Amino acid sequence: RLAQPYVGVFLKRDDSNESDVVESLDEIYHTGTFAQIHEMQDLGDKLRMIVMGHRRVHISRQLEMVEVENVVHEDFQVTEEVKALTAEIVKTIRDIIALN
Amino acid sequence: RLYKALSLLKKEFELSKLQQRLGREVEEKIKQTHRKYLLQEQLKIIKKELG
């Protein structure tokens, strides 16, 4: 019924437990990744929703919900030598998809 | 132009050295994680193959 349906995406902590997910709110990490929903399908099961890592957020306390786009991204003004490392990073990434 | 190209080769090569050296130090600082943790990983992979 909302004009902008949405879903948040967080990452689970160690020892996943559905009962704790409904009992306590600390199992979910303070990090959350809010994103807009695309479309439901439910071909076989009644719940096959799609999720995305779109807007990162770190709620200060999910138990308390307030949120802010604290997408920290500090970068040095000279963006010439910082990308030299990127060639090795992509070369590593290329080696993972290549060898594996 | 050949000297300017040499000075650019100096700056670019010294830059590749600082990037390779910072990356080498940074690889050693990953290598500071103990080998016990690696063998423990293999123990975990031995258990990972327990399905």
Mind explaining what this structure looks like?
It is classed as motor protein. The entry lists the keywords human mitochondrial AAA+ protease, motor protein. The entry is titled "P1b-state of wild type human mitochondrial LONP1 protease with bound endogenous substrate protein and in presence of ATP/ADP mix". The structure is cut from a larger assembly and holds two copies of chain A. The first copy, chain A, is extended. In chain A, 22% of the residues lie in helices and 18% in strands. Chain A has 100 residues and is α+β, with helices and mostly antiparallel strands. In chain A, strands 1, 2, 3 and 4 form a four-stranded antiparallel β-sheet that branches. Chain A contains two helices and four strands; from the N terminus they run ββαββα. Chain A binds chain B through residues 81, 84-85, 88, and chain B through 15-16, 18-19, 22-23.
Question: Gist?
Answer:
The structure is cut from a larger assembly and holds two copies of chain A. By secondary structure, chain A is an alpha+beta fold.
